[PDB]
């Protein structure tokens, strides 16, 4: 009795995945600011004096 | 013939505040498959004599 092989079949055990996603968002911002400025200027020249 | 030279100095102080509110939604779908064992088969059979 002998055994002969006629075909070899390979099944790869790899895992494949796919993902699909959607996002919607809304943001609201309120801002409040105050500023203070102090300035000093010195000028000197000759305009008819 | 008039001329003038001016020198100025300025200092500014500023304070600010801000508040932000955010809301968001998300929706995901995913599908995964194994390439080694992808499906199972069932055979409806009958015997005869």
Automatic annotation (TrEMBL), chain A:
<protein>
    <submittedName>
        <fullName>Iota toxin component Ib</fullName>
    </submittedName>
</protein>
Automatic annotation (TrEMBL), chain B:
<protein>
    <submittedName>
        <fullName>Iota toxin component Ib</fullName>
    </submittedName>
</protein>
């Amino acid at each position: 009795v002998g055994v002969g092989m006629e075909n070899l079949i390979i099944s790869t055990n790899e895992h494949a995945s796919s993902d699909q996603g959607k996002t919607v968002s809304r943001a609201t911002t309120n801002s409040k600011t105050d500023a203070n400025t102090v300035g000093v200027s010195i000028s000197a020249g000759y305009q008819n004096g | 013939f008039t001329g003038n030279i001016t020198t100025s100095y300025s200092h500014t102080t500023d304070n600010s505040t801000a508040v932000q509110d955010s809301n968001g939604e998300s929706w995901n779908t995913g599908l995964s498959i194994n390439k080694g064992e992808s499906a199972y088969i069932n055979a409806n059979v009958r015997y005869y004599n």
